[PDB]
Design a protein around this ligand. Sequence first.
Ligand SMILES: CC(C)C[C@H](NP(=O)(O)CNC(=O)OCc1ccccc1)C(=O)NCCN
Ligand SMILES: [Ca+2]
Ligand SMILES: [Ca+2]
Ligand SMILES: [Ca+2]
Ligand SMILES: [Ca+2]
Ligand SMILES: [Zn+2]
Length: 316
Amino acid sequence: ITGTSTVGVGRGVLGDQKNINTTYSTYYYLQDNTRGNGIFTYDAKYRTTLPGSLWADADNQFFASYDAPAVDAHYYAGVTYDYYKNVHNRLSYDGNNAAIRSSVHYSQGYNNAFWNGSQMVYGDGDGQTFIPLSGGIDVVAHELTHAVTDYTAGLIYQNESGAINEAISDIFGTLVEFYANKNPDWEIGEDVYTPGISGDSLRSMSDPAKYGDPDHYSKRYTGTQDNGGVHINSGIINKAAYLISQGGTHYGVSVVGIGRDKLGKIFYRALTQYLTPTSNFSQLRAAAVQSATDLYGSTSQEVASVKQAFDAVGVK
Ligand SMILES: CC(C)C[C@H](NP(=O)(O)CNC(=O)OCc1ccccc1)C(=O)NCCN
Ligand SMILES: [Ca+2]
Ligand SMILES: [Ca+2]
Ligand SMILES: [Ca+2]
Ligand SMILES: [Ca+2]
Ligand SMILES: [Zn+2]
């Protein structure tokens, strides 16, 4: 909408207070004009029609319980935009400052979030498996990263390419969580998963097997569930990424860590310069090796550690 940029205040899903960029035109809208061509947050009103209505508020204060998922979807989309711009010199998901749109209160009891090809969508959860999923910064950044992937490598959402697609979203979701520096970890979704169970998460990148996911290519899932295991086999690549950053010895193979920033640079370059829609795990290894070579040199520790990490997870 046309209006003037304003700053509201509210509380997110976890009860924390934050300032949000809004727009005033009769109402105050969840429309942030400070980033690209805007960040827009919509109310799906418990239905499945998308996007729903641009979020409107009478007073620019967002402290109602119903407001909380919208506050966090809006705010964390801003953080994710800032990460891509400041760290990778990428302007929104298309590189040309496309408007970023999210809908919250999608459906009833909906234990998921997704990019639908055009926008982000967040359920409220059922209160047992999830609380409203935009409360997780890693979740929001996971979703926006699907848009980045779709505009760049275009990894098809099945089998190995789809598991790479998933891992890219978990990697950058985690790197955004570290960028914001509030309780960062290498787990996925911990802030919104299972409110009645402390200390768990949906997936672990540091130890995928903690939640049943493979941590070595020999343990990959080969069936048809979950589009050929895209959220399962992502563990193999997540583990490789964790090892590149943090190091470790895994199935007897030792990896010298090079840190999160270099992990992000290598994978961002791989994603945007070398991967293709049908890349498999072996092709990802080659793209990461080439990317590290471009950035750090063929004889660098960074290249050596990329190779060790993929060896450690059984990807040649
Ligand atoms: C990070 C967690 C909390 C959420 C995550 N969801 P996701 O991967 O983004 C789903 N996207 C998914 O299907 O795109 C495929 C698709 C294409 C076009 C239209 C609709 C859909 C996940 O791991 N979900 C699995 C939860 N068990
Ligand atoms: Ca209000
Ligand atoms: Ca965390
Ligand atoms: Ca996390
Ligand atoms: Ca939990
Ligand atoms: Zn995903």
